[PDB]
């Protein structure tokens, strides 16, 4: 049963370094090469370099030569990669993939990738802003802007409005995240009966409720 294990997430401050890990199991560690890859959500994969767990030899992407360091620990079957002088820009997901160099030449098995977040931001609670229209069914929303870390929980009318609710993924903007949620309600219920979005941000023990008033 081949498996490559990577931690799910790391959080480091800009200026520091991180040692990411990739622990192999299910095959002879040394008969396959190990590769590291960077993925910026939605911009593509970039090869960082590869290591031969046998001899410890590496080949790097000239672009990463001074940013990445590949190493291997034969006894514990883990490949590691250090990243130095981190900055907000290094935030991405880093995968480890196995390469059948001696065989058929494919990156057959991959790690689940590790999401690195480099941020200088402290635990900060979101500021929720009502999203009312301006003109059958009507959509309402609420903006959960500038919070850190992840995640926030958004609910409508404490859960009664559980259908036709969309909570979008967050975008990391200048070390702080932003998210949105919208709910679709009969045009009769609104603005007659009120709609409140309940944002909860655990890291900062926050609970904000905002009634969406027409305007």
């Amino acid at each position: 049963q081949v498996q490559l294990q990577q931690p799910g997430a790391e959080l480091v401050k800009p200026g520091a370094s991180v040692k990411l890990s990739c622990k192999a199991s299910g095959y002879t560690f040394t008969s396959y090469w190990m590769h590291w890859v960077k993925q910026r959500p939605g911009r593509g994969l970039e090869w960082i370099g590869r290591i031969d767990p046998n001899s410890g030899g590496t080949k790097y992407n000239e672009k990463f030569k001074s940013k990445a360091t590949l190493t291997v620990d034969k006894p514990s079957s883990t490949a590691y990669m250090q990243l130095s002088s981190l900055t907000s820009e290094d935030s991405a997901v880093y995968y480890c993939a196995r390469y059948d160099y001696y065989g058929s030449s494919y990156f057959d098995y991959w790690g689940q990738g590790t999401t690195l977040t480099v941020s200088s931001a402290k635990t900060t609670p979101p500021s929720v802003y009502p999203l009312a229209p301006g003109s059958s069914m009507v959509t309402l929303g609420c903006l959960v802007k500038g919070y850190f870390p992840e995640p926030v929980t958004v609910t409508w009318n404490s859960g009664s409005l559980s259908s036709g609710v969309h909570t979008f993924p967050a975008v990391l903007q200048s070390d702080l995240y932003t998210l949105s949620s919208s709910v679709t309600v009969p045009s009769s219920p609104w603005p007659s009966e009120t709609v409140t979005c309940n944002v909860a941000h655990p890291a900062s023990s926050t609970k904000v409720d905002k009634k969406i008033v027409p305007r």
Partner: protein, 211 residues
């Protein structure tokens, strides 16, 4: 120092035969580029399909095959299945570097296409007070899950300050995405009309806000 190109998105139906291509900017792709095919399925799930131009990774259905068609590497899915709906990247080797293409989003229609439902909300009032104004453009229920969002502030394409989420799979198997246009309490007041334009499988929906 080479650039790998793939089609952006393609759509097929179960049972069909489709071919993804991989071009190199420096010449023909040859067996020395050891073309690799990788699949990304939702939840950051990678699987290698083809290695060495044409070696099918073990446990990869036989409907997947790799080859060279002229000057490019190609992946042909013979009898596409709905499970085949994912992102496919190709990688080429250049003596000592690997270069990955941009990915091809393959959609294998497991349900009828669906037009997005676009919503634009102006900066809320309590926000201008921060001397900041964020315009929100909400787009849900579309399929295939590939759209193009364009903002138009006073009639001129806005080519900065706009951030767009990558489509996320809803539970119905349709997608949603959201675009934000962040301005200054200032910029907001200085302009007249805001527009969020979403292009989806050839048709365009335009949500306009009239400050």
């Amino acid at each position: 120092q080479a650039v790998v190109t793939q089609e952006s998105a393609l759509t097929t139906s179960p049972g069909e035969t489709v071919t993804l291509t991989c071009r190199s900017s420096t010449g023909a792709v040859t067996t020395s580029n050891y073309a690799n095919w990788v699949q990304e399925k939702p939840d950051h799930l990678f699987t290698g399909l083809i290695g060495g131009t044409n070696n099918r990774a073990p446990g990869v259905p036989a409907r997947f095959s790799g080859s060279l068609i002229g000057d490019k590497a190609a992946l042909t899915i013979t009898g596409a299945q709905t499970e085949d709906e994912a992102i496919y990247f190709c990688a080429l080797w250049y003596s000592n570097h690997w270069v990955f293409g941009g990915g091809t989003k393959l959609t294998v229609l497991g349900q009828p296409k669906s037009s997005p439902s676009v919503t634009l909300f102006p900066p809320s009032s309590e926000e201008l007070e921060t001397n900041k104004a964020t315009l929100v453009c909400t787009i849900t229920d579309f399929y295939p899950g590939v759209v193009t969002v364009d903002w138009k502030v006073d009639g001129t394409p806005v080519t900065q300050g706009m951030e767009t989420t990558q489509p996320s799979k809803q539970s119905n198997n349709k997608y949603m995405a959201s675009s934000y246009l962040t301005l200054t309490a200032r910029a907001w007041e200085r302009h007249s009309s805001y527009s969020c334009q979403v292009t989806h499988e050839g048709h365009t929906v335009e949500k306009s806000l009239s400050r």
